[PDB]
Amino acid sequence: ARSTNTFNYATYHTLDEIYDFMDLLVAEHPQLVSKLQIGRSYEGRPIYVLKFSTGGSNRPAIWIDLGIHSREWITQATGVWFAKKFTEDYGQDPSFTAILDSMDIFLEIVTNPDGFAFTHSQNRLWRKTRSVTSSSLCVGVDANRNWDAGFGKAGASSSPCSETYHGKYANSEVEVKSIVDFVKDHGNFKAFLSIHSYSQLLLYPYGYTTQSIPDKTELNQVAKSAVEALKSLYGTSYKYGSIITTIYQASGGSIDWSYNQGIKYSFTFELRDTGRYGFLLPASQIIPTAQETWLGVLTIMEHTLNN
């Protein structure tokens, strides 16, 4: 691919192809997109975040991370499509244009690069990071159980070999701490969205406690509107609700942390499908998934802008 216009959005890519894609996009829209490095992975790979902005200084921002669980390939594929979509819709779509004229968007397409490379090289179903534990032969931590929100509590495992191992201590994984520091230093984030797969669900806090959030009524209606918008394209059916009541108890989650930091609009998406293909979703469903997911995400962005 020599231009983001010749890039194949209908197929799965490697880490190098996604990283090259980032530089092409920045070179093509220098006035709108910029690439930031917020840290390095355990194995030394750079951790990139794309910033979409039309100016200003520390404007209210929207955070979107995809691929924290490496085997969920549909998310990184959706992230690349999203990045391109932002550059094409600005100045064409009234709604999105108004959003970008007042807010900045931070997009992290590959949140767990070490795991992503491993899924391409050794094990397609690997989900954790690749950090080495002092006294154990098992590798990795579940990056979505390593956050400082009910850390170490029921809903995660203390065994290094577990698929849901929470780690030695909150923020022990550099891939997580890098996001924590960035968001805290910025201090003006209004929405925080984490993209996962699969099961077709839209969730809001909390996952580690049965306690209801003070903003339940509002987020519940925002979530309802988002799924209605998402379903309008191809009829894909989504369920919504808090993490603990919709799935089960889970500790150390990212949106539980972001919400406790004051970021009101914290949501987690679980994309296609409902089990037919699971994590191995066919390449031919990449674009349809991205297109419908976009409508749901845009709906939450619109709400964030007016409140």
Ligand SMILES: O=C(NO)N[C@H](Cc1ccccc1)C(=O)O
């Ligand atoms: O199967 C998946 N894919 O994300 N996630 C499950 C359920 C989940 C989703 C979102 C938040 C907390 C818990 C898991 O144990 O990680």
Ligand SMILES: [Zn+2]
């Ligand atoms: Zn996941």
